[PDB]
Every structure is written in structure tokens, then in C-alpha cells.
Design a binder for this molecule. Structure first.
Ligand SMILES: CN1CCN(c2ncnc3[nH]ccc23)[C@@H](CO)C1
Length: 167
């Protein structure tokens, strides 16, 4: 039993809700919140910009030190950093950005990072400003993640379409 509330159950391990991931994280304080990161951990917009804003830019400060030490992530890769005031940990995961021409096959590799964590609050990878089809992202999530994932979908219209079209 966990404290996630109001989710629709899609499969044995995947749950979904129309919610602002920032507000969900502040309420639940999950062990792991997933960020829709880029390889430079530049949290300018989309989910990343919103999460970073909610940390008063502390996420960005920590991220800049991480990059200065380690260099950029790989597309499809991840790193674990602090969750600041939102969660114990933030798993920064880089899905392919279609608006940069990156290979959508890397979306499965991106979701594989979730399997290193027993329970996560997450957005749909590569959705939103990353330019991928969110219906496809949900399919890859369900077919790749085996740990317990609670998906927050900001857009109510999109949430309804994801549920109604889910196979
Ligand atoms: C795939 N898209 C991208 C972003 N988005 C979010 N989902 C949850 N929390 C969020 N905070 C800022 C954006 C955002 C959904 C659309 O409302 C899904």
C-alpha cells in the first residue's frame, strides 16, 4: 500500500492520473520523481522547467555541478539526483526529443531506467515539448516498465484520449 490517490489502473504495475506532476510530488513526497530531462540537465521548460521552478532553482544549481563533473547524459540515459522539496530523489531521464531528430527507438531505453526503482511518480517520456506521440509513449511505458509507475498527465484532454485509446 502506498499514498498515491485517484489513479486509474492500466495494468498490474502502471497507473495513470490527470494531474500536475509538481502538485502531485508536493502532496505525495514520493521516493522517486522522474524528470523529463535533456542531456545537459538544462531545465528550461516543459516538465523539467516546472519541477525546477518548484525547487526555487535548486535543481538547476545541483544539475550544473553534476554536468561540470560528469559531462552530459546519453539520450536514453539517466542520473539520480536530489528530489529537493518534491521527493527523496529525482531520476532525471532523457527521452529522445523528436524536435531534435533523435531516434524514437531510444524511448524504450529511456523507460528501462525506471526498472531500477521499485516505485516512481513520472511523466510520459518524450511527450509534450519533446515531440513524440504520447499514445506511443504510454505503450512503450507499459511494455517496458516492470516496477510500479504512477503517471501524471497534465492535459485533461490528453489524459482522456490516453485512457479511451488504451489497449
Ligand atoms: C507528455 N506531456 C508533457 C507535459 N505534461 C505534464 N504532465 C505532468 N506534469 C506536468 N508539469 C508540467 C508539464 C506537465 C503533460 C501534458 O499536460 C504530459
Amino acid at each position: 500500500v502506498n499514498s498515491f490517490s485517484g489513479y486509474l489502473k492500466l495494468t498490474d504495475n502502471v497507473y495513470i492520473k490527470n494531474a500536475d506532476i509538481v502538485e502531485e510530488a508536493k502532496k505525495v513526497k514520493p521516493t522517486v520523481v522522474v524528470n523529463a530531462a535533456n542531456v545537459y540537465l538544462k531545465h528550461g521548460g516543459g516538465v523539467a522547467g516546472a519541477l525546477n521552478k518548484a525547487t526555487n532553482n535548486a535543481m538547476q544549481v545541483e544539475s550544473d555541478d553534476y554536468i561540470a563533473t560528469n559531462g552530459p547524459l546519453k539520450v536514453g540515459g539517466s542520473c539520480v539526483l536530489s528530489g529537493h522539496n518534491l521527493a527523496k530523489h529525482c531520476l532525471h531521464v532523457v527521452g529522445p526529443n523528436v524536435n531534435k531528430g533523435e531516434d524514437i527507438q531510444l524511448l524504450k531505453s529511456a523507460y528501462e531506467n525506471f526498472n531500477q526503482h521499485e516505485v516512481l511518480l513520472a511523466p510520459l517520456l518524450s511527450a509534450g515539448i519533446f515531440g513524440a506521440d504520447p499514445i506511443h509513449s504510454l505503450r512503450v511505458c507499459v511494455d517496458t516498465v516492470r516496477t510500479n509507475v504512477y503517471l501524471a498527465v497534465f492535459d485533461k484532454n490528453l489524459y482522456d484520449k490516453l485512457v479511451s485509446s488504451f489497449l
